[PDB]
């Protein structure tokens, strides 16, 4: 099941993008990851359609609050990637 | 209950925002987070009114001391958001 | 009791603040906190008069060494803020 | 065996690179390394042909998400270097 | 018990400063501290005259190799400052 | 014995420096250090000639992959300096 990622500079922008991503026809919040330098990545999992819609809504929400750095969907992620997710 | 956040660049400004918010209204200080690049977010919970007054006061007190980067209120935060809060 | 904070760019200016502050007066050096972007916050506790004199003395001294980003005293922080302080 | 590294600005680009790499060939995902200013290095091991396939796949995928900082393959790292690798 | 500090951006410049300061009557190398962001402070202890000379020589040598951010001596450090040294 | 360091901005350029260094001369790779802001130091030990050959070769290989921030040799490091090396 697909993975939506929204990365911001700023935690308030990340919390808002998360809030905005989980209403959703089945996407749950996995968590966020800090890599230092003010950069926060929020990660959701769900079916590709709601995930695509959810990550778009996250980026638009976060953009109101802060700086959005990356927006991305991985529709069919490999098993091995799991081991690098929060 | 509602969620409030004030994100500052600087820890001194954040501690002032925190102290100003809890004296301004019936909110509870949930905690603060650091994400690097000098970014510190303080987070409060309470009803939507008290969180709105608390953030405005916390922003205003922080601005007297340091840089405020974001002020935001989530009036009805989704259950999944509990996951990623201090 | 009272809270004093001198925030500097770089560790050398923070060591200088700390030394000036604990020399100053009857106050306890708690330590310092890193928040990224080279910022270091020095934290002391003591009676309000000493913490006032000490943060004055710390800021003055740090300024001779490098950049002082913030200086603040909170005479009587709220109990919930105490929970989040270093 | 060979060593493959793709280095990106940000975690969202690094996760894309990582997914693309393990998906594209018979390589083992080691993990990733944070080094500050937002830079993340993804590291993979496998035979030289697959590592060349995977680092190519990884870097082209990541360019669509964010900035790629380095792309490199070491067919046969020295023993002393094996010692210091993730 | 005087304290010499040289703060560099970059570890090579710091190692070079350390090696140039200790060649010196009695000044001993205390250690170095990283605060993130590329910033390293080298700290020496010894008598005031030899520490002033050591830190001037260390800053000169470090500037040959990298960027020097602060240079400072505290002639008579308070005993509580030891708490925040590496 | 002599001391060689190459400091890169980027982990990928540092691994390349380390590999090129030990394939260049009779050096031991002591290890690498991270200090934030993308800066990685690779350190080698050996007689002065080899350490000079190695750092030149490590620098030259890293530059084909990323930025080199510093290249330095200490031919006769003070014994005090061994305490701060990895």
Residue numbers in the entry:
A (entry chain D), B (entry chain B), C (entry chain F), D (entry chain C), E (entry chain A), F (entry chain E): 4 to 89
Cite, word for word, the article reporting this structure.
Overexpression of K26D or V51D mutant PduAs resulted in no higher order structures being observed by TEM in the bacterial cytoplasm despite the proteins being produced in quantities suitable for crystallization and structure determination (see results below). The lysine 26 mutant is the most important to study structurally because Lys-26 is conserved in all shell proteins and contributes significantly to the interface between 2-fold related hexamers in the native crystals. Two crystal forms were obtained for this mutant using commercially available screens. There is clear electron density for residues 4–89 in nine copies of the PduA subunit across the two crystal forms, and the C-terminal residues, including the additional 23 residues, are not seen in the electron density maps. In both crystal forms, the regularity of the tiling is lost in that the K26D PduA hexamer no longer has strict 6-fold symmetry, and the separation between hexamers is greater than in native PduA sheets (67.2 Å). In the first form, strips of hexamers are formed, and in the second, sheets with rather poor hexamer-hexamer interactions are seen. It is perhaps not surprising then that no structures are seen for the K26D mutant in the bacterial cytoplasm when PduA K26D is overexpressed. For one of these mutants (K26D), crystals were obtained, and these crystals reveal more fragile hexamer-hexamer tiling than in native PduA in one crystal form (type II) and only one-dimensional tiling in the other (type I). The mutation K26D has a profound influence on the conformation of the neighboring Arg-79, such that this region of the protein no longer adopts a single conformation in the crystal, resulting in breaking of the 6-fold symmetry axis of the hexamer. This results in the imperfect tiling of PduA molecules seen in the crystals and apparent lack of tiling at all in the bacterial cytoplasm.
